[PDB]
């Protein structure tokens, strides 16, 4: 992103991340062995801080731009779970897929009453 050329402008960058939820899951797997106390449903007490530390770097500044697409996993089909609920506030466009539409043979199974954009 922050790369320039002599008499040459910058370049646009596309970034693709697959299942950013596994990052928080791996953080969960080692929290107890580090000596912390659990919170919520067995989650680490530093979920939001360590999500935000990574999320604030994926951005576009005055010098260069980044377009990113991420896939977010929803455990046990529960949108109320702390990880997706914390993740919801870091995005500009959110697409929500539902199993009820998928089981009816409709593809892509995008829920039109829960998808928003700025």
Partner 1 sequence: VQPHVVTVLADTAIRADNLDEAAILEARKNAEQLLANQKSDLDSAAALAALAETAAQLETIRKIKNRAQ
Which residues form the interface with partner 1 (CB under 8 A)? 41, 76-78, 80-81
As a whole number of Å, the end-to-end CA separation of the chain is: 24
Nearest CB to partner 1, comparing residues 28 and 68: 28
Query: Do 82 and 74 form a contact (C-beta atoms < 8 A)?
Result: no
> Can you tell me the distance from the alpha carbon of 73 to that of 38, in angstroms, rounded to the nearest whole number?
21
Going by their DSSP bridges, the two strands 93-94 and 66-70 should be labelled as unpaired
Residue 77 CB, shortest distance to partner 1, in Å, is: 5
Nearest CB to partner 1, comparing residues 37 and 76: 76
Nearest CB to partner 1, comparing residues 3 and 78: 78
Residue 81 CB, shortest distance to partner 1, in Å, is: 7
């Amino acid at each position: 992103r922050d790369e320039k050329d002599e008499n040459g402008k910058g370049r646009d960058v596309l970034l693709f991340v697959d299942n950013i939820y596994r990052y928080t899951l791996a953080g969960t797997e080692v929290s107890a062995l580090l000596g912390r106390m659990p919170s919520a449903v067995g989650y680490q007490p530093t979920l939001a801080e360590e999500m935000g530390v990574l999320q604030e770097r994926i951005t576009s500044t005055k010098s260069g731009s980044i377009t990113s697409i991420q896939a977010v996993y929803v455990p046990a089909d529960d949108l109320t779970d702390p990880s997706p609920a914390t993740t919801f506030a870091h995005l500009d466009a959110t697409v929500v897929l539902s199993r009820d539409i998928a089981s009816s043979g409709i593809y892509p199974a995008i829920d039109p009453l829960d998808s928003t954009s700025r």
